[PDB]
Amino acid sequence: GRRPARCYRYQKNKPYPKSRFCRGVPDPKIRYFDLGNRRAKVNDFPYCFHLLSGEKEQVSSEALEACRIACNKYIAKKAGKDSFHLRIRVHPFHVIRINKMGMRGAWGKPQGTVARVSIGQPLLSVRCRASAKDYVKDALRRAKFKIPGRQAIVESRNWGFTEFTKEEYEDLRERGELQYDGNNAHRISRKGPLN
Amino acid sequence: GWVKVQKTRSYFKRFQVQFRRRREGKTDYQARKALIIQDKNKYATPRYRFVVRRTNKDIICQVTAAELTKDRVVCAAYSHELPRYGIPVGLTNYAAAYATGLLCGRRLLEKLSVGIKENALAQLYPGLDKATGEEYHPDENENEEVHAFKAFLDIGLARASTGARVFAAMKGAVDAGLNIPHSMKRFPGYSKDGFDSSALRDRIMGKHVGDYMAELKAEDEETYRKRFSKYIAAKVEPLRLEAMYTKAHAAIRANPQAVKAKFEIKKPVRQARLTLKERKERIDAKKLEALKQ
Amino acid sequence: ENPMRRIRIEKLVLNICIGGEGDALTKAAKVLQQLTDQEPTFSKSRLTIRGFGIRRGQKISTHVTVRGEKAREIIERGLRVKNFELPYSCFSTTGNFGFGITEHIDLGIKYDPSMGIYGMDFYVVLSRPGFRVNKRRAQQQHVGASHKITPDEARAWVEREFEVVY
Amino acid sequence: THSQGYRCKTRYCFARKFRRHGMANLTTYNRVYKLGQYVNIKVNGAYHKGMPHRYYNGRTGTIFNIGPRALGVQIQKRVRGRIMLKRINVRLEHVHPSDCRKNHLERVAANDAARRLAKETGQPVPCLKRQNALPRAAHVVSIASAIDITPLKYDG
Amino acid sequence: AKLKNHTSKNQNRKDHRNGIKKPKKSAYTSHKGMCPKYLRNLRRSRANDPRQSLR
RNA sequence: AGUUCGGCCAUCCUACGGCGGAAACUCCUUAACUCGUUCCGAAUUAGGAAGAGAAGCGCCGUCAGGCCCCGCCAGUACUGCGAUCGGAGACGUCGUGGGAACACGGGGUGCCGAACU
RNA sequence: GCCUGCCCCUCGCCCGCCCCCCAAACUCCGAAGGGCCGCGCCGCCCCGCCGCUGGCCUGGGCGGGGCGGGCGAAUGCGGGCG
RNA sequence: CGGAACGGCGUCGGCCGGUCCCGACA
RNA sequence: GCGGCGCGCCUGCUACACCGGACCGCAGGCGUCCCACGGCGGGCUCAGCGAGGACGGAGACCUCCCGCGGAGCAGAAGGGC
RNA sequence: AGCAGAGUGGCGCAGCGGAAGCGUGCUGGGCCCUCAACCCAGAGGUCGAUGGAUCGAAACCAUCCUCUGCUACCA
Known part of the structure; x- marks a missing residue:
């Protein structure tokens, strides 16, 4: 039944993705x-909160799904689906193998997929408005229990999901040096054809 | 209707420009490697190639050896100089080719034997005094002590055809006294059974040009004037064509020495490249025009 | 207004893709030869498809490239079959244009049972002096954007030479 | 390794460079070679005749033979405890001249040039031996503007 | 049953015990694999004048 | 200035828009020949000289793309060597040496010989 | 909307700009770290020899004689061969 | 005091803010 | 034992940038096919975008245009052109 | 564990790169003196879902769900 998961907690094998070889x-x-x-x-959505990872571990897709469902429901119930945008940053690309039950022909057939993370790697990030700003930290704490090891929720200086800090974003927006691209924005980029 | 650009930044990043002379279209490197290669057991002894190049109004003939960073021209002859030797017009014709080939060979053989004054090149290999269109090899006939200057034909991007003007220039050089390896298949008069000397001689001594000039005169006089306006202007008759070449082949043999021709170097108007501040001045002003709207 | 900027027909290509019959293709070659006075060439099939009933390497088409007076003389007859009416969209980005007529009888060929009706597509290529730069073996370089025929420049010259209405 | 054919493990070694695919610059054939010359062997993937094995890539050697279309090179391969001279015949494309002795050749001439002057003007001769850096020296340096630097407080 | 398939440990030590032996001096000058023509010329050239040991 | 043959082969390339030709180069101009085309004088081969800067070409432009160089990135990431260093481990430090890359910001945008006019 | 109309809206589809996260069997870039080789004999003039080489009086080798010279990284240490 | 995710108003030491003599419905 | 064959050989990887590296490790091949699918010379440009042109559309043919190979080169794979 | 097959009308069972098909049910229409047969119509399908793959897939391919047959090495 997907095994204990303590079996596939650490990145002990070289990255094995889905490929022509792995079918x-x-x-x-x-x-x-x-x-x-x-x-x-x-x-819209000025404040950001990030769930970071304190370990170089492999989280399972089962865990990543369990956490997103838990986090989405708390902030949607407490505030609204409209209030926040939650991005699961990690994607499950490694393909874990199980040797079904001796050590002859032990190469295992795929059992599932895991996300290789590192120290300080944001795993879940929420962009939120003021209505849900307080509730986001609790919601990401609910997600912390579904993820193996110790993780930390911190507020972000960067406006939304952009790389501009809230101070840089406010100043640039005032002088019209910011071009909106939708969910995210970039600097006006003075280069290229003038026309 | 919404196309994807073929030339993306990726295509420009991964693009490898070819050799400058291959991008220009001037040089076939695969052919030139073969002409350039000499066995390393022969070391740096110079190897010579006979370049023959036809422009729209010229036949340029050169003997060049390839150094490491350059190509050194041992001797050059151009059909532009044929008026001095008595060929007024038809300077890109088969007869002009032969004349430029003889001039190249004679100019080089003299330039090799200028101070030797004993048994050297031009005296040793006088060539075919009369330009019969017969197969002649300076090598093989006689090569002891001094040997015939050896060069190999470089035709460039020109097609090798029977009766090609590049082959005619080589025939002139062989007739001057230059060892150029040849088989005569791509020469007028080759038959699987055997060469007809007269057919090469006819093209070398005009003939087909003269025959056409007389055919037009016989029938379309208006066309005759249009086709051969310079020939009529220079008073070159159709029967007299063979004679002028015969005098010219003697003239090239007797005095093949190059005489420098004077000219003036005039640059065209040539616009000036702008300074960075000049470029910035235009850009800031162009943006201000957009601001003004 | 350089004389070298004058647009001339480079050539006219008349292709007859009969299909995999073989018999009809020789008859189309005869029809093409009578129109152009030059031997047509046969085009082999690149792949095989049942819907077209062709196997790879089967001769499936017949084409001729006619240049000079014969080109525009033939083109005029083809235009007459469409009453000098052209689609407007028919002009390509590179300034070429095509007709495409059904039947060979209209081009003035006389109907015979041995060669049944064979439609062909007339493609007219519009050039200018100096387009040799892209076709010469030595020093081949692309033509400049200026000297290339715009689609609009093609329509204007054909309206002058053939009085066509779009 | 379970397969050991002539060109094994040569995927990145015998591959051409990013923009350097294509035929050889004609200097490769034109460059003159002399017996005893130092030659660095760098295999070119495009030319397949006379290709030295992947072991011979990166090996400096001397030209034992100058032959038609091919240079014989003596390179030293350490097999076990014995270094063995191996004589390989490599075609022009996969061999290049080496600047191994160029610093020695430059030094010999510079040493003679100083000596030539020592015979004539300025008879005393400077030391013509390389010195391995040496331990600096004294000197007075103006502190004048010295920036006071402090370890910076941790951010994160 | 199963024993070690391969080991390299100690083999470098064993090689360096008295090893890293340079390959002779005659080998660096041998005429094996040299150009047959160049070698014939060398013999003819050294078979004339003081070098000649022909008597 | 421009041609022919070259060297290294984008600071040389690509796009577009300008400009300029006295000569040169080219386009061009015709098939009696010579040669030529899966058909086609398109190319090519021959023979020219009625034209032409319109292109190719040579210069110049463009907050151009690419390419080149230098900063910064960043002593960062990684790593060689010592640690009875820390940590349950995962991993990280500290001494002692090495040290990127992507972005990003600026500036550039062929040069070399031989012959010839 | 209306006989209908593609007289028309909305997402997908194409194209561009972005953007999250990747690769043992992807690489434009590219370390640390390793590898191979060099670190003493020069330069000058003249002379010989060669079925080799070549337009040549060209080379390229192999020698000889003069003319000036000079031992040109640090450290430790006598090496080789049967 | 082999040992984890997780808890601890056990006790010392920090880090960053708010209320603070505008003494923290009157 | 059964079942495989790293029992002779080959490509990419494992393999930790010289070379060398182990496994009943990973993803795969080989025991043949071609007197042309060979040698050589000439000429040529490939896969495709995009736009055009009777039937003709997803799909066959014919044109230009731009095409760094995105095609092909007997078969694995990687180079190479 | 792991292995093979299937999943298609209400029941079955085909199809298999270009429809859904036949029987039964299932009504209707014939047919006769009436009935039985019989004949002929009419209708019945997320083709177990999904993603890919295509101009297009029930089909072909991956994932998964469900059933249904095969399964453990004496010492």
Whole structure:
């Protein structure tokens, strides 16, 4: 039954993705990575909260799905689906193998998929408005229990999901040096054809 | 209707430009490697190739050896100089080719034997005094002590055809006294059974040009004037064509020495490249025009 | 207004893709030869498809490239079959244009049972002096954008030379 | 390895460079070679005749033979505890001249040039031996503007 | 049943015990594999004048 | 200035828009020949000189793309060598040496010989 | 909307700009780290020899004689062969 | 005090803010 | 034992950038096919975009245009052109 | 564990790169003096879902669900 998962906690093998060589991989449990109002503008949703990872471990797609369902429901119930945009940053690309039950012909057939993470790697990030700003930290704490090891939820200086800090974003927006691209924005980029 | 660009930044990043002279279309490297290669057991002894190049109004004939960073021209002859030797017009014709080939060979053989004054090149290999269109090899006939200067034909991107003008220039050089390896298959008069000397001689001594000039005169006089306006202007008659070449082949043999021709170097107007501030001045002003709208 | 900017027909290609019959293709070759006074060439099939009933390497088409007076003389007859009416969209980005007529009888060929009706597509290529730069073996370089025929420049010259209405 | 054919493990070694695919610059054939010359062997993937094995890539050697279309090179292969001279015949494309002795050749001439002057003007001769850096020296340096630097407080 | 298939440990030590032996001096000058023509010329050239040991 | 043969083979390329030809180069101009075409003087081969800067070409432009160089990135990421260093481990530190890359910001945009006019 | 109309809206489909996360069997870039080789004999003039080489009086080798010279990284240590 | 995710108003030490003599319905 | 054959050989990987590296490790091949699918010379440009042109559309043919190979080169795979 | 097959009308069972097909049920229409047969119509399908793959897939391919047959090495 998917095994204990303490078996596949650490990155002990070189990355094994789905490829021409690796066939018959069971489909990953998590398919929805952009959730919430994933279509909101950069000027909406100013604050960001990130769930970081304190270990170099492999989380399973089963875990990643269990956490996103838990986190989405708490902030949607407490506030609204419209209030936040939650991105599961990690995607399950490694394909774990199980040797069915001796050590002859031990090469295992795929059992599932895991996400290789590192230290400080954000796993779940939420872009939120003020209505849900307080509730986001609790929601990401609910997700922390479904993820193996110790993780930390921190507020982000960067506006939304952009790389501009809230201070840089506010100043650039005032002088019209920011071009909106939808969920995210970039600097005006003075280069290229003038026309 | 919405196309994907063929030339993306990726195509420009992964693109490898070819050799400058291959991008230009001027050089066939595969053919030139074969002409350039000499066995390493022969070391740096110079190897010579006979380049013959036909422009729209010229036949350029050169003997060049390939150094490491350059190509050194041992001797050059151009059909532009044929008026000095008595060929007024038809300077890109088969007869002009032969004349430029003889001039190249004679100019080089003299230039090799200028100070030797004993048993050297031009005296040793006088060539075919009369330009009969017969197969002649300076090599093989007699090569002891001094040997015939050896060169190999470089035709460039020109097609090798029977009765080609590049082959005629080589025939002139062989007739001057230059060892150029040849088989005569791509020469007028070759038959599987055997060469007809007269057929090569006819093209070398005009003939077909003269025959056409007389055919037009016989029938379409208006066309005759249009086709051969310079020939009529220079008073070159159709029967007299063979004679002028015969005098020219003697003239090239007697005095093949190059005489420098004077000219003036005039640059065209040539526009000036702008300074960075000049480029910036235009850009800031162009943006201000957009601001003004 | 350089004389070298003058647009001339480079050539006219008349292709007859009869299909995999073989018998009809020789008869189409005869029809093409009578129109152009030059031997047509036969085009082999690249792949095989049952819907077309062709196997790879079977001769499936017949084409001729006619240049000079014969080109525009033939083109005029083809245009007459469409009453000098052209689609407007028929002009390509590179300035070429095509007709495409059904039947060979209209081009003034006399109907015979041995050669049954054989339609062909007339393609007219519009050139200018100096397009040799892209076709010469030595120093081949692309033509400049200016000297290339715009689709609009093609329509204007054909309206002057053939009085066509779009 | 379970397969050991002539060109095994040569995927990145005998591959051409990013923009350097294509025929050889004609200097490769034109460059003159002399017996005893130092030659660096770098295999070119495009030319397949006379190709040295992947072991011979990266090996400097000397030209034992100068032959038609081919240079024989003596390279030293350490097999076990014995270094063995191996004589290989490599075609022009996969061999290049080496600057191994160029610093020695440059030094010999520079040493003579200083010596030539020592015979004439300025008879005393400077030391013509390489010195391995040496331990600096004294000197007075103006502190004048010295920036006071402090370890910076941790951010993150 | 199963024993070690392969080991390299100690083999470098064993090689360096008295090893890293340079390959002779005659080998560096041998005429094996040299150009048959060049070698014939060398013999003819050294078979004339003081070098000649022909008597 | 321009041609022919070259060297290294984008600071040389690509797109577009300008400009300029006295000569040169080219386009061009015709098939009696010579040669030529899966058909086709398109190319090519021969023979020219009625034209032409319109192109190719040579210069110049463009907050152009690419390419080149230098900063910064960043002493970062990684890593060689010592640690009875820390940590349950995962991994990380500290001494002692090495040290990228992507972005990003700026500036560039062929040069070399032989012959010839 | 209306006989209908593609007289038309909406997402998908194409194209561009972005953007999240990747690859033992992907690489434009590219370390640390390793590998191979060099670190003493020069330069000058003249002379010989060669079925080799070549337009040549060209080379390229193999020698000889003069003319000036000079031992040109650090450290440790006598090496080789049967 | 082999040992984890997780808990601890056990006890010392921090880090970052708010209320603070505008003494933290009157 | 059964079942496989790393029992002779080959490509990419494992393999930790010289070379060398192990496994009943990974993803695969070989025991043949071709007097042309060979040698050589000439000429040529490939896969395709895009736009055009009777039947003709997803799909056959014919044109230009731009095409760094995105095709092909007997078969595995990697180079190479 | 792991292995093979299937999943298609209400029941069956075909199809298998271009429809859904036949029987039964299932009504209707014939047919006769009436009935039985019989004949002929009419209708019946997320083709177990999904993703890919295509101009297009019930089909072909991956994932999965469900059934249904095959299964453990004496010492």
